[PDB]
């Protein structure tokens, strides 16, 4: 097949490679955590405007996304750049739901990639925002002439992200500063927020909340729990230490980590050791064996007998009787009837 011919001459050829698949899945997560209320961050008789920016802190909690669907009025949980299916068990650190209420009539502007007048003056929305868009059916409760929800339409100039408008500084466009008069070319934020029912389909402020995201910069803080399983030794398994995917053989190690040090690396800028998340034990990560296969044949014009050479692997690791979990299914190579010879 690999020479694409029905006749093979005398020689040695390289055909494929062999490897060992993982046999077990091991997950090791910290056993300390707290309950995570997704929509209990706010608790008041009446909500406030964007200028509030005051909320309780949510952290070190089990962020089970099934709780989001458990609530009746929760609708939006999809991330624009990341599929929610993978997000169902993804772990993040220091994620909190911001408390700010906006009209919400610009759905495309909230998502990264677009900036507008509201982004120019009220609150900047940069084209590269790590936060996602989260929304739920709560317009009727928040919405109610009525200008209690003040918004800053005009400002000095464009503002950098996190430079929110807290202290009202009205625009100055003259020799004298605006002093107590809302004269020409001088505007005040005191105007109705369009609470009238003339646009009953939707114009009232809709609670759009963006949540800050961190990607494995620190050990996982907020995410749902998973079934912890005891670690195994001397077996090619799928290890899930600290929420990091991997596959290899776990064994005891003597890598003297510092009290704060967690990971380990070598000259090949790849992981080499890991510390147990539960007990104070140090283990070195190494993948299970692999190599190449060479076929020695005298030629199809003489005989169909062949000999198989395994490169760089001892005879004990890969005998001809192992068929439990490996590549090369039909590759039995018979048995020890023909003696195995160990070469360099």
């Amino acid at each position: 097949c690999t020479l694409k011919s029905f006749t093979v001459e005398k020689g040695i050829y390289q055909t494929s490679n062999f490897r060992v698949q993982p046999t077990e899945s091991i997950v090791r997560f910290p056993n300390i955590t707290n309950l995570c209320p997704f929509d209990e961050v706010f608790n008041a008789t009446r909500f406030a405007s964007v200028y509030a920016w005051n909320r309780k802190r949510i952290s070190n909690c089990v962020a089970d996304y099934s709780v989001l669907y458990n609530l009746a009025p929760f609708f939006t949980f999809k991330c624009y750049g990341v599929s929610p299916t993978k997000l169902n068990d993804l772990c993040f650190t220091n994620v909190y739901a911001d408390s700010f209420v906006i009209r919400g009539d610009e759905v495309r502007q909230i998502a990264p990639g677009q900036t507008g007048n509201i982004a120019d003056y009220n609150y900047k929305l940069p084209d590269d925002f790590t936060g996602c868009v989260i929304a739920w059916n709560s317009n009727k409760l928040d919405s109610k002439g009525n200008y209690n929800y003040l918004y800053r339409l005009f400002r000095k100039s464009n503002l950098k992200p996190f430079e929110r408008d807290i202290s009202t500084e009205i625009y100055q466009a003259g020799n004298k500063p605006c002093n107590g008069v809302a004269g020409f070319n001088c505007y005040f934020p005191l105007r109705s927020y369009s609470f009238r029912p003339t646009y009953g389909v939707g114009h009232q402020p809709y609670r759009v909340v963006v949540l800050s995201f961190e990607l494995l910069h620190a050990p996982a803080t907020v995410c749902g729990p998973k079934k912890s399983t005891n670690l195994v030794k001397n077996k090619c398994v799928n290890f899930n230490f600290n929420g990091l995917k991997g596959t290899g053989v776990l064994t005891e190690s003597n890598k003297k980590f510092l009290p704060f040090q967690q990971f380990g690396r070598d000259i090949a800028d790849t992981t080499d050791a890991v510390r147990d998340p539960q007990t104070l034990e140090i283990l070195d990560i190494t993948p299970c064996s692999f190599g190449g296969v060479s076929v020695i044949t005298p030629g199809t014009n003489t005989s169909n007998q062949v000999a198989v050479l395994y490169q760089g692997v001892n005879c004990t690791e890969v005998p001809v009787a192992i068929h439990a979990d490996q590549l090369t299914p039909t590759w039995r190579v018979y048995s020890t009837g023909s003696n195995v010879f160990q070469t360099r």
Binding site: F257, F263, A273
Partner: protein, 271 residues
């Protein structure tokens, strides 16, 4: 008091101000990292906390801008300095920090406080709760609290003739506050210059607060003249930080034993 000004001087920092940049443990490798570090052979100011005018309190708590980092150090014989109050303008309207060492707790108190003109403490506890908390009188609103063991594990109960070499780096970036520290013994009694020797600043604690800091202030502990409020001799160093490129040489143990920058001189760039 009606104290007078003092002229700040400078001294050579030699090879100082190296901390572990990353959590990953590596050994026998020569990794190069790009981060903020104290440049080799840079001017560092060395305020001398001595008995002012033989018993007159001095204003040795300057309102030094924080900029991007500090290399606060100490060659004190005993414990005289506690307090690293930060603030945008040091008033009741600005969120401020303070690292006190009351009893055996750091007491990380993140709130707004009204600060006196000359905040100071007492090293000896008052007789019969002490009245040491005179640095502030009112606290309005509070967000975060952190109580744990004191940052300072050094003890003077053994004997004298040996001083401390406390070193600290206060780095605040992107809503995080990291603290690094290390202590080593000193042989020579001369406080003019730091001994030439490599030291590693192992991290101690991380803070998730996102406060805006534009200034740095320090506090002193003066219990009593035993006129005014005074104690023994002390000295601390203040040094700023700017981004640089460094090369670190880990050992077999996994600890940084030497480092070479890449901007000091042509030989450094060649290396």
């Amino acid at each position: 008091t009606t104290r007078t000004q003092l002229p700040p001087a400078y001294t050579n920092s030699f090879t100082r101000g190296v901390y572990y940049p990353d959590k990953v443990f590596r050994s026998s490798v020569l990794h190069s990292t790009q981060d903020l570090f104290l440049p080799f052979f840079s001017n560092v100011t060395w305020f001398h906390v001595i008995s002012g005018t033989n018993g007159t309190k001095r204003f040795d708590n300057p309102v030094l801008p924080f900029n991007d980092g500090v290399y606060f150090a100490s060659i004190e014989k005993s414990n005289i300095i506690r307090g690293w109050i930060f603030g945008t303008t040091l008033d009741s309207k600005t969120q401020s920090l303070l690292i006190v060492n009351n009893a055996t707790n750091v007491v990380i108190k993140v709130c707004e406080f009204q600060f006196c003109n000359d905040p100071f403490l007492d090293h000896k506890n008052n007789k019969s709760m002490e009245s040491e908390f005179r640095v502030y009188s009112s606290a309005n609103n509070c967000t975060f609290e952190y109580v744990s063991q004191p940052f300072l594990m050094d003890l003077e109960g053994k004997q004298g003739n040996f001083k401390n070499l406390r070193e600290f780096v206060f780095k605040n970036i992107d809503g995080y506050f990291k603290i690094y520290s290390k202590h080593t013994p000193i042989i020579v009694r001369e406080p003019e210059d730091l001994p030439q020797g490599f030291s590693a600043l192992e991290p101690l604690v991380d803070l998730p607060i996102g406060i805006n800091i534009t200034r740095f202030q320090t506090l002193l502990a003066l219990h009593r003249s035993y006129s005014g409020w005074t104690a023994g001799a002390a000295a601390y160093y203040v040094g700023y930080l700017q981004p640089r490129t460094f090369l670190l040489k880990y050992n077999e143990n996994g600890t940084i034993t030497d480092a070479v920058d890449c901007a000091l001189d042509p030989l450094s760039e060649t290396k």
